[PDB]
Design a protein around this nucleic acid. Sequence first.
DNA 1: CGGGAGGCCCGCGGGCCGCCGC
DNA 2: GCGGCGGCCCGCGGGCCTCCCG
Lengths: 210, 209
Amino acid sequence: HNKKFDRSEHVYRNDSFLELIKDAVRFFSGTPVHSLPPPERFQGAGVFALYYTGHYSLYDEYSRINRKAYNLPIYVGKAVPAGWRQSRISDHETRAGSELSNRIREHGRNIAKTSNLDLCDFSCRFVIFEATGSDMISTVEAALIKIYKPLWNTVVDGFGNHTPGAGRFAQAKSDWDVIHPGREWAEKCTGVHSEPYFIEERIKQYFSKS
Amino acid sequence: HNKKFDRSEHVYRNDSFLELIKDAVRFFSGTPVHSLPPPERFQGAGVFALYYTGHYSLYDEYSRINRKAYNLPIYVGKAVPAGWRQSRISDHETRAGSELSNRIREHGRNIAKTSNLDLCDFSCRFVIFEATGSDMISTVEAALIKIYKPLWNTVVDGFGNHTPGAGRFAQAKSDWDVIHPGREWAEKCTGVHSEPYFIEERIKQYFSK
DNA sequence: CGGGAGGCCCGCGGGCCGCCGC
DNA sequence: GCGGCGGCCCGCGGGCCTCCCG
């Protein structure tokens, strides 16, 4: 403890970065668009976007919005370097990892298990933030989400989830699993999930705004 | 697609964003130290670190590391503003929330619950990131953890847990709990958990190079 | 039988609900 | 009945574990 509490001295303002962020976003937007997952595997961590062009009833708008360019993301994720929680890269260095390609791939697999979504109707964009750049990954991801408010980011939860595992079978599958059954593990959960009607209604709210 | 695939076309080269973290990390280091919890409540979202100065056997070494200054944190966390998960911020009708303060206190309180740690032996530092700097919170925390590798984040897991609740009761009591009862809810967990000897043996290792 | 990738655990803490004191 | 405080759900995904191919 120290006498004289003064809140002003704990606040961190440094505007320098906003322009760094808008430079990243700017760049992201012009990166080539590939199918899901990309035709080759690659090393790197970074950020990515998923785009829909199919006609599943609830999402048909995207085939309209995205008809002429990949304009609106359904989802935007990030693959951060290994070591975010414990930072234990302490005596086993690398092996330049490839965690971005891996998530993107994982997400492709999950879609491919759904009954009502066709992986052929998704594409992506992704950026690799190198060496020291890796520090941006999160911040850019937030900006992208602030700009597009992608549906699986701002209305429908659970796309990005891993299995809860035994020990957590009792919890509820996510909204994302209720409307898109089924990853196996989603079907082993006994927990009371949302009711399809509420999730569908949230989705319609999302597509009302001009 | 339509293209070739040219990994190179997706690469973002940047070097100065790292300097921003440096600035934030160094600034954090400078901020006034307060006990746990801080003497007053305050509004803001951001990052905080916790400090030990006590003599509970296993952690006694901190009383020698932090003897002269608040050097090495035992745990580093974050608190992000309300509606961050679905990017509906103080829209309508906040940003005047006080989530940083509030989590610092839930932390104090968990500690107060243990039978073998004394709250007075803990101090803290915190940084508030204001609007539009809150995008950064996540990252500063990660750097702070990379730099200080704080025992609880990197070795004695669990302090971070809120109650897992029903639905998750079959998981294993966390390392942290198994050395620091008694959070009510940890007793409800039924998974096969790690052994005190190996947890203590890991703490001994933390202080050995 | 070691390195990599994907499987299967729980960590951190966000969000929302309910109880409480205004 | 509000909003502040706690408590109890789970999102979101990191990391070790495994299984397999050398």
